Structure formats: C-alpha cells, structure tokens
Amino acid sequence: KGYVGDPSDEYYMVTFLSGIDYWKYCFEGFEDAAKAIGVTAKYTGQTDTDVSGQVAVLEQVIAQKPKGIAVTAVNSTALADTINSAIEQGISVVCFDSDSPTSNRSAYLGTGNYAAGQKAAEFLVPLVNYKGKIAVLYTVGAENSESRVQGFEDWCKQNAPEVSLVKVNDAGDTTVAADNLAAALQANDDIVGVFCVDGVAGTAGPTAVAESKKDLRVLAFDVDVTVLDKVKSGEIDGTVAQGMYNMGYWSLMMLYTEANGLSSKALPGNLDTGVVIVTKDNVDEYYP
C-alpha cells in the first residue's frame, strides 16, 4: 500500500460555522489533497459556534469510524477529551486553523501568528517609508492577536528603528474599537499607518480612519468580502490572507500518512502554512 488510496477510507474536515466562506478555501485544499491520493474527503461541521454542538457533531463523525479527521476546534480546551477517545479507538487526528494543543493530536497546520506579524510589518512599514508611528488595532487578551503584535513590534525594532507603535484595543466590539482608534488618532499626530490584526479591527479600523479624514496606510487581516472590496477600491492598501488552501492540502497528507503508516516516525508537529499579502494585484484570486 502506497499513496494510492481507497475511496472507502473516509476523512473528515470538521469545522465550526460550516457555511462561512473561510472554510471553502480550506476544503478546496482538503478536496485537492484527495484529488491525487484519491481518498474520500467529506466536509462537515456545526453551523454555529456552539461548543456543545461541536462536541456532538464530531462524536457522530467518530461514530462513522473514519481513518482520519482534520478538525478545527471552537476552543483550545473544549475538544480536549472528545478527541482523545477518538485516538484511543484507532483514529488519526490532526488540527488545522484552531488547535487543541493540550490534546493528543498528532500535528497542527495553521498560521504562525508571530511570523504573520513579521510579514505584515515587511509590507506596511515600507509603505510609510520606515518612519512615523503605526497604530495597531488588536484584541487585548487574544493569544493569536498578541503574537501578531509581538512579531510586528519585533520586526520594527530590528529593521525600522525610527518606527514606533501605539497599541489600541478593539475589545472584540466594533463600536468600542472605532472609539479607541479615534482617540488614538487624536493624541498621536505622527501616526502614518494602521495594522488591523483581527476581524473586529478590519471593520472599525477603516471607519475610524475615514472619519478621521486622514490619508493613512492601512493593512487589514483575513479575506472578508468587506475587506477585499476595500483593497480593490483603494480604501486600504491590502490584507493578510492565511494559507487556508495549504491548511486543507497538507492536512490530509499527514492524516493519510499516519492512517496507514508510510512513515516510520511520528509526523512533524507544526506546519506554518504562512500568509499572503493581498493587494490589487492578486485580490481577484481570493474573492468567494
């Protein structure tokens, strides 16, 4: 038995908010991984963010007895126990997008958030010519947001010494975010750029900049249709797209390799699927 697989070996991509466009980019790689090893790729998940619901839908995925599940967990600790029972009954499970690291999953395939911040700084800082202040709008307390800010700030400290940052909390709310960004622009007249780290920031960010009536360089995150339209119209300069296709593509490679055993050692633990800066040159490639 090599990589020529059987369409009878079922492999699930278990998600939350199954209907949103984000998972379409991921499953397109998951169902492209299965386009050559030729195994069965199914796409299921809970339609909402409910933790109780996600535990229930993966128990039914486990009930269908698959050789391997690529699952993104709603929480870092909620799917802890339900995924261990799966492994105890001969199921190979990796995690993509959102990881359950305290679990016994074999590998994680997702964005290196610290590295993602460095790449975002590699693009935004030259736009402001390596000088001035850059406002960073992020959710204080969110692990990935803090890692993106740290990578951003660290890149600036090593490569753009004349650049300083002002940290602005969005508090996971668009109304509070736009207010905090408005006050930041009022107190700091040397602000030349705005990095929107999360979704909430990608919404209240441009609004507080437009009301400011200041011409600043804005970089958002992810590929929401609202953000993509701002990139095409020229309201913002770009957005950071996660390697969603890579998350689905390489998840089945590790899952199948573990399912049968075509590698003598355990799989690599972490794959950084990277980020791509979406500008006017490539924004058409990311529209749903």
Numbering used by the authors: 32 to 319
Question: What does the literature reporting this entry say, word for word?
Answer:
Clostridium thermocellum has extensive potential in lignocellulose biorefineries as an environmentally prominent, thermophilic, cellulolytic bacterium. Previously, five putative sugar transporters, denoted A to D and L and belonging to the ABC transport systems group, were identified in the genome of C. thermocellum, and the solute-binding lipoproteins (SBP) of these ABC transporters were shown to bind different dextrins by isothermal titration calorimetry (ITC) assays. To gain insight into the structural mechanism of the transporter specificities, 11 crystal structures, both alone and in complex with appropriate saccharides, were solved for all 5 putative sugar-binding proteins, thus providing detailed specific interactions between the proteins and the corresponding saccharides. Combined genetic, biophysical, and structural studies have provided solid evidence that transporter A and transporter B are the major glucose and cellodextrin transporters, respectively, among the five potential sugar transporters in C. thermocellum.
